[PDB]
């Protein structure tokens, strides 16, 4: 909508599920907020999927994240507002990028796998 | 764009929800000091 350079941009149906997963990972200490921490997780190879926002006006500050995901074969998806993503991540400040890491025997494995599947069929 | 206020459950403009959460939880005893 606002930004044509939005490839995996998701609609207002699975965005609710994405934010629910973000909150649950927050309760489980299972996310890294911020573009820099998402990039570090991608570099370490422990990132499972990262969600960013299409409201950051210089989107190219976070447009290296989909390229890094393509390099590491990591699902990636956008949202429609940075404020909602930030508030869902567990912080008041607007966040434009968050990552979800791994956990041994995680209770969120089924939902994170479902989210990975849902995003991967939305690229086209 | 409309969101839902977590505290009052009423439709709110998406642009204001940040300072809406900043100010709708304004601590009442702060007013006297």
């Amino acid at each position: 909508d606002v930004n044509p350079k939005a490839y995996p941009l998701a609609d207002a149906h699975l965005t609710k599920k994405l934010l629910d997963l973000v909150q649950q990972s927050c309760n489980y200490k299972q996310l890294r907020k911020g573009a820099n921490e998402a990039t570090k997780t991608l570099n370490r190879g422990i990132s499972e999927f990262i969600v960013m926002a299409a409201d950051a006006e210089p989107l190219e500050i976070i447009l290296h994240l989909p390229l890094l995901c393509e390099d590491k074969n990591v699902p990636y998806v956008f949202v429609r507002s940075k404020q909602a993503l930030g508030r869902a991540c567990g912080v008041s400040r607007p966040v434009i990028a968050c990552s979800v890491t791994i956990k041994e025997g995680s209770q969120l494995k089924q939902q994170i796998q479902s989210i990975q599947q849902s995003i991967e069929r939305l690229l086209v | 764009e409309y969101l839902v206020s977590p505290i009052t459950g009423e439709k709110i403009p998406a642009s204001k929800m940040q300072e809406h959460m900043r100010i709708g939880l304004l601590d009442p005893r702060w007013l006297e000091q």
């Binding site: 909602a84 508030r87 | 969101l3």
Partner: peptide, 21 residues
């Protein structure tokens, strides 16, 4: 849709409710 306020304002709002009561 709604937004999920963070734990800091969770504690703040709980304190407001209890002090109010």
């Amino acid at each position: 849709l709604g937004v999920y306020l963070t734990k800091k304002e969770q504690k703040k709002l709980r304190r407001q409710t209890r002090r109010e009561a």
